From Swiss-Prot:
There is a cross-link at K19, K83 (Glycyl lysine isopeptide (Lys-Gly) (interchain with G-Cter in ubiquitin)). As part of the heterotrimeric replication protein A complex (RPA/RP-A), binds and stabilizes single-stranded DNA intermediates that form during DNA replication or upon DNA stress. It prevents their reannealing and in parallel, recruits and activates different proteins and complexes involved in DNA metabolism. Thereby, it plays an essential role both in DNA replication and the cellular response to DNA damage. In the cellular response to DNA damage, the RPA complex controls DNA repair and DNA damage checkpoint activation. DNA damage-induced 'Lys-63'-linked polyubiquitination by PRPF19 mediates ATRIP recruitment to the RPA complex at sites of DNA damage and activation of ATR. Ubiquitinated by RFWD3 at stalled replication forks in response to DNA damage: ubiquitination by RFWD3 does not lead to degradation by the proteasome and promotes removal of the RPA complex from stalled replication forks, promoting homologous recombination. The lineage of its organism: Eukaryota, Metazoa, Chordata, Craniata, Vertebrata. It is linked to Pulmonary fibrosis, and/or bone marrow failure syndrome, telomere-related, 6: An autosomal dominant disease associated with shortened telomeres. Pulmonary fibrosis is the most common manifestation. Other manifestations include aplastic anemia due to bone marrow failure, hepatic fibrosis, and increased cancer risk, particularly myelodysplastic syndrome and acute myeloid leukemia. Phenotype, age at onset, and severity are determined by telomere length. The chain holds residues 4 to 119 of 616 of the full protein. Component of the canonical replication protein A complex (RPA), a heterotrimer composed of RPA1, RPA2 and RPA3. Also a component of the aRPA, the alternative replication protein A complex, a trimeric complex similar to the replication protein A complex/RPA but where RPA1 and RPA3 are associated with RPA4 instead of RPA2. The DNA-binding activity may reside exclusively on the RPA1 subunit. Interacts with PRPF19; the PRP19-CDC5L complex is recruited to the sites of DNA repair where it ubiquitinates the replication protein A complex (RPA). Interacts with RIPK1. Belongs to the replication factor A protein 1 family. It is found in: Nucleus; Nucleus, PML body. Changing R36E: Loss of HELB-binding. It comes from the Eukaryota. This is Replication protein A 70 kDa DNA-binding subunit. It comes from Homo sapiens.
Amino acid sequence: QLSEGAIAAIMQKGDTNIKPILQVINIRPITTSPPRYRLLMSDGLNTLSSFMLATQLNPLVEEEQLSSNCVCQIHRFIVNTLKDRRVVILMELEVLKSAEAVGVKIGNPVPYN
């Protein structure tokens, strides 16, 4: 299942030792130079919009294996605090279930604050 509470752990304790299972709700590019993908992710309990993808993972998006509704396991991530907002950069992951396998948004997660 999804790692409910992983988002809270990341935002509240900066816990980078966990390897959470998350669902991609949405992935979108920022184009300006290699694009940066931003992800809205769900841990089954909460959603959070401040995920970004390391550029090394861009081929997973560009070859459509990392896509909305897929389920991934995060193997390495960083949390930064911006000048103004915390952001989570996904450094290593594997796609456990394709978007097509999962099919729908899992549960009814609540937006994190």
